[PDB]
Design an enzyme around this catalytic site. Structure first.
Site, short mmCIF file in Angstrom:
data_model
loop_
_atom_site.label_atom_id
_atom_site.label_comp_id
_atom_site.label_asym_id
_atom_site.label_seq_id
_atom_site.Cartn_x
_atom_site.Cartn_y
_atom_site.Cartn_z
N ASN A 29 -1.25 -0.69 6.22
CA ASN A 29 -1.48 -0.22 7.58
C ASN A 29 -2.93 -0.37 8.01
O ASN A 29 -3.25 -0.23 9.19
CB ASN A 29 -1.06 1.25 7.71
CG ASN A 29 -1.93 2.18 6.88
OD1 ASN A 29 -1.95 2.11 5.65
ND2 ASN A 29 -2.67 3.06 7.54
N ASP A 49 0.84 -1.19 0.00
CA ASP A 49 0.00 0.00 0.00
C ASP A 49 0.88 1.26 0.00
O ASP A 49 2.09 1.18 0.23
CB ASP A 49 -0.93 -0.02 1.22
CG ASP A 49 -1.94 1.12 1.21
OD1 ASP A 49 -2.46 1.45 0.12
OD2 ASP A 49 -2.21 1.67 2.29
N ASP A 70 -0.37 5.18 0.97
CA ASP A 70 -0.65 6.12 2.03
C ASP A 70 -0.57 5.55 3.44
O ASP A 70 -1.22 4.55 3.77
CB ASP A 70 -2.02 6.75 1.79
CG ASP A 70 -2.05 7.57 0.51
OD1 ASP A 70 -1.29 8.55 0.41
OD2 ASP A 70 -2.83 7.22 -0.40
MG LIG Z 1 -2.75 3.02 3.83
#
Ligand SMILES: [Mg+2]
Length: 181
Positions: A132, A21, A23
């Site tokens: 995250n 991922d 961001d």
């Molecule tokens: Mg993320």
């Protein structure tokens, strides 16, 4: 549906495919001006060019270089390409990413942009996802390598601390034996 990834390169057929991922995982971007930003790019929204301030997570350079060598890396973000592409172009100086998947490649399942790993077209015993946000992989909790959300802690070492573990994962036959399932 067509698989999200093409045939694996000869050299990547026996390698684990890692979905990464963007961001809060590799970087943190903001519309509010920040000091010492790493990238400051233009992103057009509703006809207006906005300046996006991107900060790189500590050790991301060493991270991408190494991961790119170890696995068949794939960028899978829930953000739009008009933003993730430029950022990716500046982050990946080694061609670590064999592919880039954006918002549309996610499935809007129960209010969340989910990344369906079976959608990749790779053997799940050979797939990992680093995001995250656990909500991104609701269908494959056992293919995940948990990573803390990052925003501005220049003392963060998660990316550096995870290489030893990824190192270990690259030598196993089935990632489930380690992440259990
Ligand atoms: Mg993320």
């Amino acid at each position: 549906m067509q698989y999200l990834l093409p045939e694996a390169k000869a050299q990547d057929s026996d390698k684990i495919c890692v979905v990464i991922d963007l961001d809060e995982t590799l970087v943190h971007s903001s519309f509010k001006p920040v000091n010492n930003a790493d990238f400051i790019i233009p992103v057009e929204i509703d006809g207006v060019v906005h300046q996006v301030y991107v900060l790189k997570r500590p050790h991301v350079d060493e991270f991408l270089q190494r991961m790119g060598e170890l696995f068949e890396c794939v960028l899978f973000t829930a953000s739009l390409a008009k933003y993730a592409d430029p950022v990716a172009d500046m982050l990946d100086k080694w061609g670590a990413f064999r592919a880039r998947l954006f918002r549309e490649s996610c499935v809007f399942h129960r209010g969340n942009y989910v990344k369906d790993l079976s959608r990749l077209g790779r053997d799940l015993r050979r797939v990992l996802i680093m995001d995250n946000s656990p909500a991104s992989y609701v269908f494959h909790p056992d293919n995940a390598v948990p990573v803390a959300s990052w925003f501005d802690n220049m003392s963060d070492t998660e990316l550096h601390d995870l290489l030893p573990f990824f190192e270990q994962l690259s030598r196993v036959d089935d990632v489930y034996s380690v992440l259990r399932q």
